[PDB]
């Protein structure tokens, strides 16, 4: 197929909820070595979010049974082997995204916006790996730091990509680094800085930003429960 057909097939798959199809097309678009547009970029990201989120979801359930079947030797072995099966799938997916990013998406990022997006996505998928590992937590951090630098310099505090990064990076501190302090401050600041500048919101992103700010506070409220 051609770049324009793949994209329209990717939009069809998403409405069908057929996420592997939608990621196959968007991965094929990516591998054409030309930089991706905002729309293509969001489609690749939505695709692989759902593909990996299914495994992430299967992994959580089966790990919990695994823990609950302590004392039941036969059950616990069955749950462990299957967890391990879901993990292989999950790792292959994270490395699919991570290689795509490394080879195509990060080098060819010609704009600060892209660069922040792809770097946040790099340590998203290393965070997904951290969930399932280890000393690869650090690489989730370096991606996210290089993204959080480039974002604070170039972007308004109400930009959804910068707020969104505030939100993921914060969860990485809270969850992967076990550090609720470095998590809460990061999200209190992201939020407080966005709320002092609500006039910098634009009609194209005010729903995106305003949502993610709610999600920043939600986390902060929980992390004080």
């Amino acid at each position: 197929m051609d770049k324009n057909e793949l994209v329209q097939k990717a939009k069809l798959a998403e409405q069908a909820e057929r996420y592997d199809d939608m990621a196959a097309c968007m991965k094929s678009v990516t591998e054409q070595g030309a930089e991706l547009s905002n729309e293509e970029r969001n489609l690749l990201s939505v695709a692989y979010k759902n593909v990996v989120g299914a495994r992430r979801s299967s992994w959580r359930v089966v790990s919990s049974i695994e823990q609950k079947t302590e004392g039941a030797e036969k059950k616990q072995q069955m749950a462990r082997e299957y967890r391990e099966k879901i993990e292989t799938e999950l790792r292959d997916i994270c490395n699919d995204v991570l290689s795509l990013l490394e080879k195509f998406l990060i080098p060819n990022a010609s704009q600060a916006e892209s660069k922040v997006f792809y770097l946040k996505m790099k340590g998203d998928y290393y965070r997904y790996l951290a969930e399932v590992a280890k000393g690869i937590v650090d690489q989730s951090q370096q991606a996210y730091q290089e993204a959080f630098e480039i974002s604070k310099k170039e972007m308004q505090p109400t930009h959804p990509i910068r707020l969104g990064l505030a939100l993921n990076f914060s969860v990485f501190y809270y969850e992967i680094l076990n550090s609720p302090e470095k998590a809460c401050s990061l999200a209190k600041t992201a939020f407080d800085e966005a709320i002092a500048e609500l006039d910098t919101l634009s009609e194209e992103s005010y729903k995106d930003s305003t949502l993610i700010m709610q999600l920043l506070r939600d986390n902060l409220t929980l992390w004080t429960s």
């Binding site: 989120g53 998203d124 997904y128 969104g164 939100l167 993921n168 969860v171 969850e175 986390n219 929980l222």
Partner: peptide, 8 residues
């Protein structure tokens, strides 16, 4: 639980 950009 904790909200990310990557759930729901």
């Amino acid at each position: 639980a904790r909200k990310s950009t990557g759930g729901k």
